[PDB]
Design a binder for this molecule. Structure first.
Ligand SMILES: Cc1cc2nc3c(=O)[nH]c(=O)nc-3n(C[C@H](O)[C@H](O)[C@H](O)COP(=O)(O)OP(=O)(O)OC[C@H]3O[C@@H](n4cnc5c(N)ncnc54)[C@H](O)[C@@H]3O)c2cc1C
Ligand SMILES: Cc1cc2nc3c(=O)[nH]c(=O)nc-3n(C[C@H](O)[C@H](O)[C@H](O)COP(=O)(O)OP(=O)(O)OC[C@H]3O[C@@H](n4cnc5c(N)ncnc54)[C@H](O)[C@@H]3O)c2cc1C
Lengths: 589, 589
């Protein structure tokens, strides 16, 4: 059975599946690129002639007749098959536009994000020809917007808990649908509500019924769909976002999307098929933060000098730069992997969401800090974009959950190979090649040889110094997984403190290797910036190898860290019991 | 000459001047306390019956007739001599009220902060009897507000650059004053503008003139003072904040405050005499964040459970708790040191500002993260208090500057003792006791003895485990200073990258020892929470000893860190040259 092409999955097994990762990918046909040249121009000039971010914020919705203009560029159909009404773009052409719009206004660009990153996305990802023909030409025009109605009060971050749910009619010719969904994008505006809901089914093991989760397409034309007024939120304000209510809505059963009960797989497939766009948009946003910053820090005097001459400004600026270049270099790589058409990349997707969402927030905060008083005002716009970033660590799955998902979904196949232990011990002689070099891991790991991994020939020689770091990290990272997995078995899923820290380890490690790949590309092709990219990549790899070391080491052994986890359980418990901070002030009064 | 009682100054010399720090201080007379008990009640109940934070934000000023009510409690005169119209409070009684108001609305409480933490503060800290009698009874009533008009466009965070400046009249009977000041609190409302400006003086070495900096008191009753409309800012919005302009304002010369040219010392004295209030207010704010947090995390289900049962929630909550308890335990300690009346504590002051301002922001961000979607809305208020915190890392001196100040002002006296080297080598025999145990440092440090430091008897025995950590940290921290100081001499002031990291080291180390002191108090007196405080203190000390290790070690030796600092200088330079992010996207387009 073929090895999972996922680099991260390989990395959990301590294997080195570079092949989704090297050379840093290129995917454009010469027409696909050339087409892109013709699109970049007018769209970006739109976002200086036409748009106005501050006014968009003030109105708490898009400029309606500026929004309209996007319909005419087909902005609501960028990924649709061209003759069915779209631009037919590959993932990576689309991602470039996502970078552009992310440079300018998160609000509009996330209204799109809802509408086309995930909104109708099921119609492409499973819809039949009849489904596409019916709905898609409407949606692509942006005459009809769509929304991904997962979340409801009871619980949103656990899909299995959704109580909003649906009765097949007795003639079977339609499903019937009920429930609230809360915080749905374009809930005021959309026509094509995708809705995810529970439904009974007669089972295929006994003919008893069980309850399973289904995804659906619902036009507001059905009647009985209704939505609240918009909520008030920290930013993104030009985006419409509301509840949606279902008055027993009827749904002709050929509007089952995918197949009844496949819905949960659909939901995770859509969200993973969308996440790359977020990293693209934040890449753009960061590009415009860092520009705004360096310009201010170019002009401001202090202490008789331009402040960019002072070390702490240089460090802040360099970090923000590295974070942008990493995010960009990851986003384009995931889009390219999809356009090539690898099928498995679930971890890389989740990692890209986590890293881009947190890193943009780090950058924007530093930006305000360098910008000082100037920065804090409503005039310079940085303030709005900061407020707008903080949302991204939450929606489209909160990063804490996504961390746990990364770690668990990762160490599925490690668990498989450990099961390979129990199998092989019970066929040592009949089977051949059963464990050849498997204990060799300990031959490598106990006696302190090189593990046998290298980036030789894989990375441009000059980088290989920093490239060496990745091997070190990898050897250390995969090592701890084995131990901490084995000790805890499938009980691991309750070792949350540990799982989180493995999530952060995986994040930094994969972020490392991505940049090291792109750097190798730019070095070899010799673009004039290639030495600059070398300098960035090296700085990142040095820091990331440091953090990974102190994570892995502090996690593997320290009794004091077990004292910490004990303390956190104790202290959290005490806070919960008291329902508050336990201790009075030193005065008692 | 007496040893500086400053613990931090001692710490720079690697000495252990616990005596400003142990036992954890108590300062209240039984009337001072009892008075406080009578004040806590009605004020806090005011901040539930009367105030409304959301409306305050909406109006972008205080509820005018709610503001009025504070005048009647004397809120604008809490520190004024009672018979001159104040409450006569010690620092620590005032600090308790600061904790209360910080629990509820940063806006009002910083309008006070401007008015009385620093505003009139020069009138107490140097004003003559005639000055106090004249101005103070007006100000204490809050009929007249006051402002600390340091900052102006040209430059604000460097006091020496202020161009706003003043001519002594030829009769000498008044000074005459000119310039703008920008971002001045209560600039719309205040009557008693303190203003800080340059002025010529005939020198006392030749009778040639030089230019020096003076502080002044200015009533708007003088005429010729004017101010802009209010600016728009991310929060705190109920605070008024504006420019102020000076139309050649005349100032009768007995309104020199302190003495002409002493102004810069006055400015730093005021700001240091104020900073403790900020740590108090944020302590309160954090107390109400963490309460809001634990309550939401007490009720929310997910995955079939209350989420507080899941490890990552427990860790977040425990950290937020530790950060609150540290901030509180520091603020009250600085206030107590002032009420006792130690004179030198400049570093502890700056540290308290840095740590409280950053730590509250860490807490508020985690609070939003646990609060998820619920958290992001305008309904629960957390979003406003988050926006309101981000300002504190900037104003009253930006933390980056304050870091550099901490490190430099610290290693002044180390430089003195190294000069003691050059002196002693040129009197080895005449002088006695010249260097006895001084090379003993290397006897201790090379051969790896204990340095001779301990907390034995100083800290409660059970803590001494975590107490041991401080000695380790201290030995490591002071060690690097010596080396990095010596190598760089007074050129050190240009080794910014290094100085910053020493600032962070000092921060964590002193924060540790503070909590270890308070914990020892609570243990010995045996308050029912004392085991809880033990658990907090231990967790903090373990983490802080870890971060200090990796700071000191990574800074002292790694060539790769010198490669980093090289890279940052190179990369920052490239960004400045290009005035932007250097590299195109992987597509070139
Ligand atoms: C709501 C609000 C209220 C305010 N109220 C007051 C008030 O009551 N009184 C008052 O005096 N001010 C007030 N201010 C102004 C605020 O305190 C200013 O940030 C500060 O006083 C001066 O900062 P600046 O912007 O002039 O610094 P800048 O000149 O803009 O420089 C600060 C930035 O440059 C960098 N920098 C500058 N010099 C150095 C150096 N030597 N080394 C390294 N980095 C350096 C820092 O990293 C920082 O990012 C207020 C501001 C706001 C937003
Ligand atoms: C502006 C905006 C737009 C939105 N648009 C959409 C949209 O288009 N589509 C959509 O589906 N949703 C949307 N949402 C909702 C958002 O995606 C939700 O945050 C998410 O869908 C579900 O989160 P929740 O609040 O229900 O999670 P909750 O049930 O509130 O739980 C999340 C919190 O609980 C903790 N937690 C939960 N489970 C665990 C666990 N197992 N272990 C440890 N900790 C745990 C986490 O630490 C986190 O802090 C939007 C929200 C906003 C604010």
């Amino acid at each position: 059975r073929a090895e999972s092409k996922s680099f991260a999955v390989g990395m959990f097994k301590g294997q080195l599946t570079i092949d989704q990762v090297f050379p840093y990918p290129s995917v454009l046909s010469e027409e696909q690129a050339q087409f892109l040249k013709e699109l970049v121009g007018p769209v970006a000039r739109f976002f200086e002639e036409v748009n106005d971010p501050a006014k968009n914020d003030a109105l708490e919705k898009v400029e309606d007749d500026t929004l309209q203009g996007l319909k005419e560029l087909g902005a609501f159909g960028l990924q649709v098959p061209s003759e069915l009404g779209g631009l037919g773009l590959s993932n990576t052409q689309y991602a470039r536009l996502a970078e552009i719009v992310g440079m300018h206004d998160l609000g509009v660009s996330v209204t799109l994000g809802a509408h086309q990153s995930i909104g109708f996305k099921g119609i492409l990802l499973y819809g039949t020809k009849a489904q596409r023909e019916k709905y898609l030409p409407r949606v692509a025009s942006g005459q009809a917007l769509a929304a991904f109605c997962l979340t409801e009060p009871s619980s949103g971050s656990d899909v299995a808990s959704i109580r909003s749910s649906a009765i097949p009619s007795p003639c079977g010719k339609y499903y019937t649908l009920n429930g609230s969904k809360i915080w749905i994008s374009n809930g005021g505006l959309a026509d094509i509500f995708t809705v995810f809901a529970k439904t009974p089914i007669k089972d295929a093991a006994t003919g008893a019924v069980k309850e399973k989760i289904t995804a659906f397409v619902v036009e507001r034309s059905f009647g009985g769909v209704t939505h609240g007024l918009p909520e008030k939120k920290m930013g993104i304000k030009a985006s419409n976002t509301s509840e949606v209510y279902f008055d027993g809505v009827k749904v002709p059963s050929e509007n089952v999307l995918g197949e009844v009960g496949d819905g949960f797989k659909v939901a995770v497939n859509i969200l993973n098929n969308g996440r790359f766009g977020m990293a693209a948009t934040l890449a753009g946003t960061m590009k415009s933060l860092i520009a705004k910053a360096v310009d201010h820090a170019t002009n401001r005097t202090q202490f008789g000098d331009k402040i960019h001459n002072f070390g702490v400004i240089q460090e802040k600026l360099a970090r923000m730069a590295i974070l942008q270049y990493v995010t960009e270099s990851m986003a384009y790589m995931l889009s390219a992997n999809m356009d090539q058409g690898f099928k498995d990349f679930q971890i890389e997707a989740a990692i890209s969401k986590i890293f881009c969402s947190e890193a943009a927030w780090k950058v924007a905060d530093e930006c305000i800090q360098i910008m000082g008083g100037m920065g804090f005002m409503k005039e310079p716009g940085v303030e709005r974009v900061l407020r707008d970033i903080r949302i991204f660590r939450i929606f489209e799955g909160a990063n804490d959950i996504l961390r746990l998902f990364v770690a668990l979904q990762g160490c599925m196949d490690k668990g498989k190979e450990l099961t390979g232990l129990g199998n092989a011990l019970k066929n040592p002689f009949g089977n051949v090649g059963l464990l050849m070099g498997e204990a060799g891991k300990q031959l490598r790991r106990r006696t302190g040889i090189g593990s046998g991994l290298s980036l030789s020939g894989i990375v441009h020689p000059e980088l290989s110094r920093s490239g060496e770091l990745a091997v070190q990290a990898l050897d250390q990272f995969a090592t701890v997984v084995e131990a901490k997995l084995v000790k805890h078995k499938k009980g691991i899923v309750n070792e949350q403190f540990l799982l989180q820290r493995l999530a952060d380890g995986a994040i930094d490690l994969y972020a490392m290797v991505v940049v090291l790949s792109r750097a190798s590309r730019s070095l070899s092709e010799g673009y004039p910036t290639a030495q600059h990219e070398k300098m960035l990549c090296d700085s990142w790899c040095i820091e990331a190898a440091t953090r990974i070391r102190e994570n892995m080491a502090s996690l593997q052994s320290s009794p004091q860290h077990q004292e910490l986890f004990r303390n956190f359980r104790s202290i959290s418990k005490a806070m919960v019991e008291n329902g508050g901070l336990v201790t009075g002030n030193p005065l008692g009064i």
